[PDB]
Point group: D3
Chain length 304, copies 6
């Protein structure tokens, strides 16, 4: 035969994972692993299966970061260069897409037929989330706050619900944790939306107000645009995707003038009270007190 | 409750599949359908199953085109604009990645315990193929022809093999058709590589010598670079990613001087001969005479 | 005294009108002269006054072309280079703005107390028209056809009305010709919108489908976008401001599929019919039969 | 009728004035209003008419800023983003051009036929000034100092003389203040020319030496170029329109080496002595002592 | 010892002369060989020496083409891609500069004490010529025709004179042929300047009117700019360095209106007449009738 | 005669030397002049000839800086703008190429036939050095450390050896100093390679890690790339030519992780010990003790 097929070699797998391994080497906050641990106080998935779920979620998380940074044309991730500024958008996009299916091969180790439908439903929902966010961005059409939370429940909540739904599939308890964890993702994203524009530590890790450079209809941005349609300064700044900080400082100033950050803080307050009440609900009906998930809720809301 | 979850709507699916429907609306060759059809003369998959496999292969094929045209920074697809030059790269990339998982969902309709692993194995090989091709392109490091074929087996063969491996999994005979189909994919790809540089039908559909613009180390380009490594004009032309026709016709002329199109024709002759031997071996061992796969063979190499 | 004021010199006026004289040297259709001439069959303005109004309308028309080609980022004007591609945007913009006021000075030669307010009212409407068109373009927000016509009445009708309103102000009859002329301007503009996409005479003078390159929401483009709002290819093509012909011919093809050129032809038929009714009504009430305005009518819609 | 014309709505006027209202909200020094107040000590125009003149001058001033920033491709105005970096050059240019004629409609409220000829003569002169400055810039031809002051007397003095000439038209005193106010504009512009390169507060408000980035043949720049034609470093730096501060710091260093800033300071001294002597001249012949205009002269000359 | 010095290898010379060999592989006119050949009818240089001078002139000529195409930012050379569009500017520039000194080494093979000073004097004049041409281009300051000719004598004559001055130095007769050859170089250059704007053979080899794209003040361009300095379109077109054909054909049309190609034809007629007089004077004083130099004369002006 | 040749004027020589005179006015470290003085303790070349050698070496040094900065697309030189950011790449390249031959005319003043062959051999070697460095850079092929030192001995050592070899030609002593001075250039370049990435004073003079922006396979960069081929982060950062400091700080961090700076320091140690032993060798055999060259060796190695 003229063609003799060769085995896949570690050296080649080291190329394919180049961009992905670069990100995993950048130190991150590891909040999804602490989310899983919190919920395991209740679901008590054994260590063998839990370690597989933690691998799958951490894998997909990094893969999405590779691809969001490309799609969102970001400069910094975790204070350091975005992977594609080193490896180029093409290899980084491929490396992330590759990992998606490496994680699918991992979920398969659970030998749990429900876990597969869960992964497929989840990846469908994640892509539906980024699909709507990109739609609004590129059409310069500000969504309603309700539309935004639907999108976030798919895009950010979608990974949280995968993690917990895989755990539910690996446990016999018949209690539905998904509503709680979806709420936690929404809070997490709204908090992330606020910190992008207000935290000094987020300026260090992504740059000043990078959501403005990216053109994102984020939560406080939506509220400031919609609080006065007569003024089109902010939505036009979004259209310009400004890299300059003079424009970003002006936008962040305009957004304070529309009380958009008290608004967001107040919404996060109301959602935290729902989450605490949901948690207390689960515990009234058979579940032991869960300090860890109360701390994960406190940690994500400190409005730095 | 502040957040109430909404259903996914037909209008939103229409947005998410915007770029995908655009490509599907472009008249194509539907070549993998004619290949499945000709293998079904042997495998005789039930029609409901063949219809599901045909949808899966159709979706994935269009989806990769979205992603591949982005990574290659192509301009034309099937003589029309590439999807991201209409919808933008981000929405094109998400549309393609989305469809990867809509197809995984469609594979589930077969209800075959082995289908998920077949899908995973193929998507992994697909990304392994494209991963290595990007690696060589981005590093300006010319592969050997042996390495090229290994990569092609994964990249172009990877989806051919997914089709025949799903069919095998739904058939009642046990014959292994994979080495044949992977040979058919290598031939298909080498022919594509030649036509991209030498066919008017391709200069009209993707533009004149578009593998040069995209910097690709394709089969004739590899041969021409390696046949006189003291002359470095062709590899340097690749690095310049030329959109200008004058540079591309000079490269094309250099490639006739190194006699690389005759080389490629000869290799295709040798590979088609192995394919016919393989087909004839399968037929001497039981299976019935397959005219259709001989026509597919003779159609894909027609201009060679 | 250190500073001594110098006079303005012929050499400096030549510099200031550099871009303006350039456009005027380009052979044009001189269409507004043929429209003034045909309304003068009724208004019978004295020749000295008509000569001043004709210079005023000529200057303003060329001046707006300078400014409009800059705001549209056009390439060709009357088949030749646009003025700023020779003189630069800044000098083209100043030349045009200058001429606005040289024309205001020429209007003063009429010595008519009401002429200044007519000029002001027209320049204001002109900028109101262009203001709204830029607003819709820059915001990627498709107007309704009713909104388009209102805008066109101001933008294209605004200078037609200035001509006829200055003439009325110098005539001795009291008939109001404005609603007719503004209808004539809306027709002129809709015809321009159609020809820009469908005429070889325009593809040679401004380039193929140049309203697409400039992102304009023109009459047929509005109809095509709104007639199937689930398909978003055409509006997305506008956002990309494509200079490539392949994208433009795809858009042009989509626009034939939504049947938007037949729609535009029908609307022009309806509007020409109103115009003839209006003309005939003016004639039944006293004024003499005006063949010339019927020829202007039939000339501007000729290719429709 | 198929077309029914709509009234202009406040919402639409809020769009047209978008860029203009943005500038008027940025806090400025308001030196033209204090110029008018100073001169009213003498002309005693009543409050009803004066308020109209102050509106017209402040309107035109902002409109010119919109357009100069576009023409001069500036980044900052009054320490904040230039309007067109938010609204785009097109809407900003239109909004400014629009305001030109809004101000003409305002001058009309004076019901003073002389005021109209004054406005027309003034707008002619302003455009003649920017016409010559742009001519020299784009031709990389350094003017003489005398040519520069002729240009400035039109460009900067032109607005000062409009303001005072409108006041003279609204007052019965037969004393010609224009020579004095033209001198004041020249001083103002030379001072502005120096502060652009030397003031720390101007670096905060426009950036470091932004006249260099813009390529302006400003007063000290002219003198430094002409003080040694053998060296072409400075005029070549002008050609490069440098955004980098390394180049601007070098240019400002070279310009100190040619004693160009003592030269400019010395010229401002001589012009202030002329202005004070002119003011004393007006007062010897009937006019009361005018402290305010002495302070406006002191405020503009403090060589920060 | 840590460092051990290696020899220079054939493979490394191949790399260094990569761009130079590329140009030499492009079919050219070999015009300076036909000029040397025709002067050798008189000077009768021994063949070994003439072969060395011919190699020196060949190398320098190709080398300057490398450097000149870089400084002019040209696209096509002899109908093919310019060397730096294949190898990059840096390697093209180094290749050319390298060859300058490989040619100095070849000049040494003549073993003539006066040859080094001849080479130096020519390279110096060559760079003096190109230096002044860049100065006028970069400063947008049109030279006088007298200045142009002085520059051309150095730039184009400079290498003609190097050839004839090396030959004179190896011959046994004492006749001075330099003023003749420098006249021949001025004629050659003026003809090149005309053909670049008017010949189909040149529009195919360098592109349509490429001196406009490169902003050159060439002989007809100088005449057209200076013949009506009130019209500034042509000089402004130079500043824009237009790659667009529409701008270039407008310039070409303006240049026919100023009657600058007839002027250039007339000047070439006058200069060819002086050349024939000079040739005939050399022949009446001893030298034999030189048909070949009359053919070179009549060939270079053929299209004029 | 129609053409009358003009003399070269000081004003024109001042244009040609524009970029070169700009550099010579920027204050530099003057290490080559102190190298020549050190070696003259031994060679005792008289002041008349030495002053010529110092002129030639300082001339060529500046000329190469003009051209390297262009080739390497640098921003700063000696803390100030690169000459071509003021004069443009074309005039700067010409001015440097011009000076090459001005220096050749200077070497001629030595009336030393050996000096000419020395200059030619040296300019050949310099261009061979930059030829190989550019080859590796543009091909993204990391050379071996041995290949790098061969290149540096030509590129940096080539000017050092010219200086000393011209002195040897002007002196009767028959002792070969070239091996020592070539070693000194290698040390100098390795030191320069390290200081580019580590010195605070080099960040001030060229910018942070400018070798990374330029894509140079410098000494520590080579060692870090080759110390782990599995990781391709650093060589890919080289390919991207990063202007951003986030990427450069990451690269410099990665390079510390591979102990590349201890490696380079250790190599410089071993080379200094060879140089000191070489110097002691020359002194054992007749040469007087040479403190100056011991200090030039100490000054270049202080690893700031």
């Amino acid at each position: 035969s003229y063609y003799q097929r060769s085995d896949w070699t570690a050296d080649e797998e080291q190329i394919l994972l180049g961009p992905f391994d670069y990100l995993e080497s950048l130190p991150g906050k590891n909040m999804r692993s602490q989310l899983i641990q919190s919920f395991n106080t209740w679901l008590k998935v054994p260590t063998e299966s839990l370690d597989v779920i933690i691998k799958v979620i951490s894998m997909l998380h990094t893969a999405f970061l590779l691809i969001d940074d490309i799609q969102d044309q970001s400069i910094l991730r975790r204070g350091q260069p975005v992977a594609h500024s080193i490896f180029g958008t093409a290899q980084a996009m491929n490396s992330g897409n590759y990992v998606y299916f490496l994680a699918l091969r991992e979920v398969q180790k659970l030998q749990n037929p429900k876990a597969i439908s869960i992964y497929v439903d989840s990846l469908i929902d994640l892509h539906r989330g980024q699909g709507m966010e990109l739609f609004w961005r590129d059409s310069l059409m500000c969504p309603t706050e309700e539309q935004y939370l639907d999108m976030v429940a798919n895009k950010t909540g979608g990974l949280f619900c995968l993690a917990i739904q895989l755990m539910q599939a690996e446990a016999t308890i018949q209690v539905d944790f998904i509503p709680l964890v979806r709420l936690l993702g929404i809070i997490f994203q709204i908090c992330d939306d606020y910190l992008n524009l207000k935290s000094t530590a987020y300026t260090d890790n992504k740059g000043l107000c990078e959501d403005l450079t990216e053109g994102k209809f984020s939560f406080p941005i939506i509220h400031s645009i919609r609080s006065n349609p007569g003024n089109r300064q902010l939505i036009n700044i979004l259209k310009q995707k400004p890299r300059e900080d003079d424009i970003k400082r002006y936008a962040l100033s305009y957004m304070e003038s529309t009380n958009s950050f008290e608004y967001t803080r107040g919404v996060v307050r109301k959602l935290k009270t729902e989450a605490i009440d949901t948690i207390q609900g689960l515990e009234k009906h058979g579940l032991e007190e869960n300090i860890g998930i109360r701390k994960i809720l406190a940690r994500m809301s400190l409005e730095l």
